[PDB]
Ligand binder design. Structure first.
Ligand SMILES: [Mn+2]
Ligand SMILES: [Mn+2]
Lengths: 133, 133
């Protein structure tokens, strides 16, 4: 089976439930950065669409990505939930943030519609990491 | 204004119409690779959700990304349209492809819901490129 380190704050999430159903072996830790660690280089940050939008409003998104990159050489951000129909911010603000993180900071931003899908992504990434290690 | 080179096959698309409304100055060329060129390093490939799925079915997606990377150091792929509810392929096949391109090949995959949104992304990326040149 594949092994993934999970931050304590994620322990009782539906993501963890699906990872367990998928047969993933989890090791719990309290991480200063990241939510799911796949390898010494690959770490995943789970962020809801609402929190992404809030971090854009408060201008804290870039500091968050900076911190991720300084801790892991190959960080990944999974944005969970729909970003559409969510007012309180012009679409260009969301688009601009996405483009900056993925193209400028060079941090992949994979989109997931549910916690189950976030788990499915974590699982397939970890499986590939294990196979090529 | 910002300047973008557009491949001839895109000339009469709704993407081009919006780019023109946004004030972008377009130079038409027949490109061997890429759909919208922003700089010597940044090129954008527009691909509909249906074509993305088809390229996964036919196993041609990776060759396409390879070709993009060999032509431009900083290529970007904009997937246009929803990938959900589109059967004829298991979700893991789509997820796996997305993860491979963005994390392994290191090519950003920005998602757009419409040709207008694809244009909005092209515009903001080009504007930033111009400002920092
Ligand atoms: Mn998180
Ligand atoms: Mn295209």
């Amino acid at each position: 089976g594949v092994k993934v380190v999970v931050d304590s704050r994620e322990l009782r999430s539906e993501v963890v439930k699906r990872l367990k159903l998928l047969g993933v072996k989890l090791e719990v830790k309290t991480l200063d950065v990241g939510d799911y660690i796949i390898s010494e280089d690959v770490a995943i940050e789970r962020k809801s669409a609402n929190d992404l939008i809030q971090s854009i409003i408060d201008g804290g998104l870039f500091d968050q990505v900076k911190r991720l990159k300084e801790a892991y050489s190959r960080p990944i951000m999974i944005v969970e939930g729909s970003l559409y129909g969510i007012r309180n911010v012009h679409p260009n603000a969301i688009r601009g943030a996405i483009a900056a993180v993925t193209v400028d900071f060079g941090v992949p931003i994979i989109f997931s519609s549910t916690p189950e899908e976030t788990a499915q992504y974590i699982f397939l990434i970890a499986k590939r990491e294990q196979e090529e290690r």
